[PDB]
Amino acid sequence: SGFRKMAFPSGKVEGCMVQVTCGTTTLNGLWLDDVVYCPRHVICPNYEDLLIRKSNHNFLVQAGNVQLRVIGHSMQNCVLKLKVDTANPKTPKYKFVRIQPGQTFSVLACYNGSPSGVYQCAMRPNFTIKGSFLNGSCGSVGFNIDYDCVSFCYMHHMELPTGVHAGTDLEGNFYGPFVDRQTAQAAGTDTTITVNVLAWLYAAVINGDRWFLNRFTTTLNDFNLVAMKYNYEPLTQDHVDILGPLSAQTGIAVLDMCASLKELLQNGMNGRTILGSALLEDEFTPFDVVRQCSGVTF
Amino acid sequence: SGFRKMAFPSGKVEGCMVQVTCGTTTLNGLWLDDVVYCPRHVICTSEDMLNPNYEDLLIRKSNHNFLVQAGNVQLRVIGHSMQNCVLKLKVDTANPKTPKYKFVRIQPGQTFSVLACYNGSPSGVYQCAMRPNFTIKGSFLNGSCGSVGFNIDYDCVSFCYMHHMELPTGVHAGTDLEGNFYGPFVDRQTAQAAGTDTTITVNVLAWLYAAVINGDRWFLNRFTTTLNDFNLVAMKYNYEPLTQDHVDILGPLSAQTGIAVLDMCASLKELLQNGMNGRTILGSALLEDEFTPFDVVRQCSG
Ligand SMILES: Cc1ccc2cncc(NC(=O)Cc3cccc(Cl)c3)c2c1
Ligand SMILES: [Cl-]
Missing domain, CATH: 2.40.10.10 (Trypsin-like serine proteases)
Structure with a gap:
């Protein structure tokens, strides 16, 4: 629980974090194989013109207490790619x-x-x-x-x-x-990530928090009409399908949980909490809920 | 049991029922806080009924045309507005019995x-x-x-x-x-x-689970079905299609009785083919479709 x-x-x-210094600017870089990736604003704008004035030794790259030597530099959109002599042995x-x-x-x-x-x-x-x-x-x-x-x-x-x-x-x-x-x-x-709030409501059900459940269901269109009024993202059929496993596990159809959300938006929590929160939480995806309520490892 | x-x-x-009279028409209204809700056709003269312009008929009405009666007390209408097919009569007293x-x-x-x-x-x-x-x-x-x-x-x-x-x-x-x-x-x-x-299929299945919870298993069988084969059969008996949403909703009842939804679907398929043969299910000789899965759980368990 x-x-x-x-x-x-x-x-x-x-194992990939390195320090990148260019002039007075110091920030972080990501060392993968023999390349260090970092924001191109480390050279600060006409980035092509500022970069052409730089030499490899202008960028001081530090991996722990070891200074890496830059052997090349190139820009890809807003990221600077500093070619280094050493490939990161800790590259995953x-x-x-x-x-x-x-x-x-x-x-x-x-x-x-x-x-x-x-x-x-x-x-x-x-x-x-x-x-x-x-x-x-x-x-x-x-x-x-x-x-x-x-x-x-x-x-x-x-x-x-x-x-x-x-x-x-x-x-x-x-x-x-x-x-x-x-x-x-x-x-x-x-706006609020609607599919994520529903996923978090399913996580609350799995954890025994059921007060917000009701007997009602809704059409996907009726729900999107309501959700648009509360600055919530539209819920698509893709989201409904993605919520399928959680719906099957808890026995609460996605449109069933949507009617719980509709009432929560119009009536609030009324002094009550869901998973220790007095706000509808939208930073857990349906996959995050399944992974945390199953124990997937890395 | x-x-x-x-x-x-x-x-x-x-505690919310009030009487709403407008001209010759008398019907019921729902008094919640300081508003009485009632069908907008209370303003019609039956001669309007065929093609009534409700905006036109309502604009000709004044607050004192609507007599609202709460028990033996006449409420005073202080405003009126129409929201779709309902008339909202603002009254000068908030219902103390408003739940x-x-x-x-x-x-x-x-x-x-x-x-x-x-x-x-x-x-x-x-x-x-x-x-x-x-x-x-x-x-x-x-x-x-x-x-x-x-x-x-x-x-x-x-x-x-x-x-x-x-x-x-x-x-x-x-x-x-x-x-x-x-x-x-x-x-x-x-x-x-x-x-x-059409028959509300998910409700009939919920009611079959209620019968099982009450000790009746005569209609069950050894068969299962695919959701698609159930729907092909059910359509022929004027039954609503059963969706995956319905199957998911039936989950708790399936878990409580140990009978899978598609298992219970095979039993419904058999009842549709055979009828009851002089038997009853929960005192009924017909398949009952006015109990939702939520109604069955509330009544059979709590
Ligand atoms: C005579 C009778 C019998 C049973 C009744 C049962 N319920 C309602 C009644 N009346 C109406 O339907 C009034 C009406 C007519 C046309 C359009 C509208 Cl929106 C309303 C009843 C009347
Ligand atoms: Cl409903």
């Missing part, structure tokens, strides 16, 4: 994956190439992450673990004025309409 | 209790199900318009139906409490017919 916001074990990723089996909003991932927050903490995030529908970052966290990565393979899905680049965070996939493509420069940028109006 | 068609206690709803309530729109197959009223006075309570053709097989006479359908799960009354009309087959049509009709019906005297009705 119990339901916690749980991150993947960070060990395979910790990995993939670079781009995630969709609503998907969750773990973030290994680092400062000076050293991991300080790990937390679980969700890519918000407005493509920002409500992370926890201080100055020096740039280059901290977001990942998932698929059996023994680390899927890198995020690299931290910046903080928006609202305290939320923006970054890219590992191919340097930003999540959201953000750019890596000092200019007026704002996170768009956020 | 025992399985009865059980209605919710009507007390919380009785904790919600307005819920139900899906076909769902059940609810009906508090039948005449002249703002409750005369009886019965259990009903929203038919797959969106009609209800109620028991209503003239003057029952405005009688409400509800469920009382826990201490909150969930209003799901307001009676508006009787179709030519003796079945009834009405709306949710936001004035949206169930089915393709309109509050007009025009030619309207209930579509071909």
Whole structure:
């Protein structure tokens, strides 16, 4: 029993964190095989022009107490790829994956190439992450673990004025309409990840929290009409299908749980909590719920 | 033990019934807080009924045209507005007997209790199900318009139906409490017919599980079925398709009795083919479809 916001074990990723210094700027890099990936803003904008003025020895890369020697440099979108002489012996089996909003991932927050903490995030529908970052966290990565393979899905680049965070996939493509420069940028109006709230309601049912259940059901269209009024993401037939296993395990049809959510949105919790929360939690995907309520290991 | 068609206690709803009179028309209204909800056709003169322009008829009305009576007390109407096919009469007194309530729109197959009223006075309570053709097989006479359908799960009354009309087959049509009709019906005297009705398959299976919980297994068999083969057979007996949602909903009953849903489906398939052969199931010689899976669990267990 119990339901916690749980991150993947960070060990395979910790062995990849290095410190990248370029001039006065110090941030984090991800050392995989003989390449160090880091935000291109470490050179700071005309990034092609700033990069052409740099030499390999301008980038000081530090892996623990060992200084790596940079033998090449190239830019792929908003990520800098520093070719190093040494292949990381701790390189795990990995993939670079781009995630969709609503998907969750773990973030290994680092400062000076050293991991300080790990937390679980969700890519918000407005493509920002409500992370926890201080100055020096740039280059901290977001990942998932698929059996023994680390899927890198995020690299931290910046903080928006609202305290939320923006970054890219590992191919340097930003999540959201953000750019890596000092200019007026704002996170768009956020919405609630509906499929995730339903997944979390199923987790609450599995943990014995059933007060919110009711005898009612709803049409998918009637629910989307209601959900649109509360700034909730539309629930698609894909989401309903994804929720299938949880629906089968608890005996509560997806549209049945949707009617519980409809009443919760119009009536609130009425002094009650669900999984120790007085708010509807949207940062657990249907897969996160199944994995935590089954015990999958890495 | 025992399985009865059980209605919710009507007390919380009785304290909300008021009489609404507009001209020659008298029907029932539901007094919740300082609002009286009733069918908008109370403003019609029966000569309007065929093609009524409700916006046009309502604009010609004043607050003092609507006489609202709560017991022996005449309530004062201080405002009026129309929301779909329901009239909302703002009154100068909040109902002190207003219970904790919600307005819920139900899906076909769902059940609810009906508090039948005449002249703002409750005369009886019965259990009903929203038919797959969106009609209800109620028991209503003239003057029952405005009688409400509800469920009382826990201490909150969930209003799901307001009676508006009787179709030519003796079945009834009405709306949710936001004035949206169930089915393709309109509050007009025009030619309207209930579509071909079908048996609520998930409810019959729930009722077969209730029979098993009550000690009856005569109808069970050694067979199982695929969901698709059950639906092919069920369609031929005018039964609603059973979806994966229904199979999932039947999960708890299947777990409690040790009989898999598709196993129980094979038993229903056999009953459809053979009939009962002079036998009964829960005192009925017909397959009962007005108990949902939720009704069976509430009544048989708690
Ligand atoms: C005579 C009678 C008998 C039983 C009845 C049972 N329920 C309702 C009655 N009346 C109506 O249906 C009034 C009506 C007519 C046309 C359109 C609308 Cl929206 C309403 C009943 C009347
Ligand atoms: Cl329903």
